[PDB]
């Protein structure tokens, strides 16, 4: 695996060499010689299917650790975990804003990104890893946040919807499905408290800030993008180590930038000086629950609340279960570690209240002719 991964990384710098040539010729100086035609075909037709199947079979080998072995036997070394992380980052940057240049090979690239994401032991890499490898993973989240911010501001009809077309097709086809898979992978393996710590949190906050900002937007593009945005936001909530819906209790959360970093810092990098101001347009948990309850009892149909059903509800359906285990009413093994008060106030009442509202929402739209959101809501609840 070490030699196989090293060759794959060797082809990654080769891949970056001819895509720039393709970008150059597609911009100026058209020429169909294609000096790297052999390299392009080998990368697309051999490497991508090989990466797709190799890491599908040996997914448990790379996710295994000496503390906890998942596969039949053996576990990847730290260097192997570092290389597979750099492979994901280089491949993601390769396809960034170049989905069209891959032609029919773009579905192959994103499928490799999905499988590489499911085989990322990011806990070990971020804890004990080289700065270069860690900086690559941080740059991926930062780049993802910037692309989503450009996407949402274009969905705000700042542009009719140049680079707007490239950014829009890259995010909805490559960035969003991959980011959803990566967050789901982090949530399943409890990597949130180890990966999203200092600058990933800032990147994840901006992604959380921007995605929810579609509530005050009414367009045709936004209507078809809600299922993708909602699923991505739900996975982010499961992996987010901070209770962004309960900023009043953030002082008791160890995995927060406002506790890990000094007040002297957090000013060299732009931060709003208060946890409540990170995403101020997100209603607090108490407010959010009241709004859903009011809509459910009012008998409102799906047409007058598409944002809540497609985005807000999946967020709460994933936020509450995560923080029910870390707050009051949890089954606490906290005889030694019970001194810090819980950073959340989620109890079984919140989950019970939300479930009752969801059931009332469904029956309000029980007899309508078309509702494709019911199947998506069922799996989230």
């Amino acid at each position: 695996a070490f030699g196989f991964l090293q060759q794959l990384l060797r082809w990654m710098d080769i891949s970056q060499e001819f895509i720039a040539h393709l970008e150059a010729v597609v911009s100026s100086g058209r020429v169909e010689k294609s000096p790297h035609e052999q390299e392009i075909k080998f990368f697309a037709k051999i490497l991508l299917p090989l990466i797709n199947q190799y890491f599908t079979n040996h997914c448990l080998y790379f996710l295994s650790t000496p503390a906890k072995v998942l596969g039949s036997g053996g576990h990847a070394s730290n260097k192997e975990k570092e290389m597979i992380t750099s492979l994901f980052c280089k491949l993601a940057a390769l396809v960034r804003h170049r989905v069209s240049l891959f032609g029919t090979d773009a579905p192959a690239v994103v499928n490799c990104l999905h499988i590489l994401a499911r085989s990322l032991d990011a806990r070990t890499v971020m804890k004990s890893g080289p700065e270069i490898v860690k900086a690559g993973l941080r740059s991926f989240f930062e780049s993802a946040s910037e692309d989503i911010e450009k996407m949402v501001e274009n969905l705000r009809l700042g542009k009719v919807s140049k680079g707007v077309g490239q950014n829009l097709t890259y995010t909805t086809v490559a960035l969003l499905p991959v980011l959803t898979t990566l967050f789901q992978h982090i949530a399943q393996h409890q990597f949130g408290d180890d990966v999203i710590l200092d600058d990933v949190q800032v990147s994840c906050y901006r992604t959380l800030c921007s995605i929810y900002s579609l509530g005050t937007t009414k367009n045709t593009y936004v209507e078809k993008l809600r299922p993708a945005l909602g699923e991505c936001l739900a996975r982010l909530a499961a992996a987010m180590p901070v209770a962004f819906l309960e900023p009043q209790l953030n002082e008791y959360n160890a995995c927060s930038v406002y506790t890990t970093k000094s007040p002297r810092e957090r000013a060299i990098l732009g931060l709003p000086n208060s946890v409540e101001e990170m995403c101020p347009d997100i209603p607090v948990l108490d407010r959010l629950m009241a709004d859903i309850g009011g809509l459910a009892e009012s008998g409102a149909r799906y047409t007058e609340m598409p944002h809540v059903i497609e985005i807000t509800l999946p967020m709460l359906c994933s936020y509450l279960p995560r923080w029910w285990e870390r707050g009051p009413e949890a089954p606490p093994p906290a005889l030694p570690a019970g001194a810090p008060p819980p950073c959340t106030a989620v109890t079984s009442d919140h989950l019970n209240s939300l479930l009752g509202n969801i059931l009332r929402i469904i029956v309000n739209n029980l007899g309508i002719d078309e509702a494709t959101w019911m199947k998506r809501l069922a799996v989230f609840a």
């Binding site: 075909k41 080998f42 299917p49 090989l50 199947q53 190799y54 040996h58 053996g74 576990h75 990847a76």
Partner: protein, 49 residues
């Protein structure tokens, strides 16, 4: 039974022999169509470690 540490050596050479040769062969659709499954099968048999 299990491999005898010599079949794995043959399998490892078989993988890199095809991989290196295919990396320099000019693109042939027929060759690539059946060489790729061979590499995937070989890679899926060798232990990663």
């Amino acid at each position: 039974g299990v491999t005898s540490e010599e079949e794995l050596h043959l399998t490892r050479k078989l993988f890199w022999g095809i991989f290196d040769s295919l990396a320099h062969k000019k693109y042939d659709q027929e060759l690539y169509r059946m060489a790729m499954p061979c590499l995937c099968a070989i890679a899926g048999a060798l232990p990663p470690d």
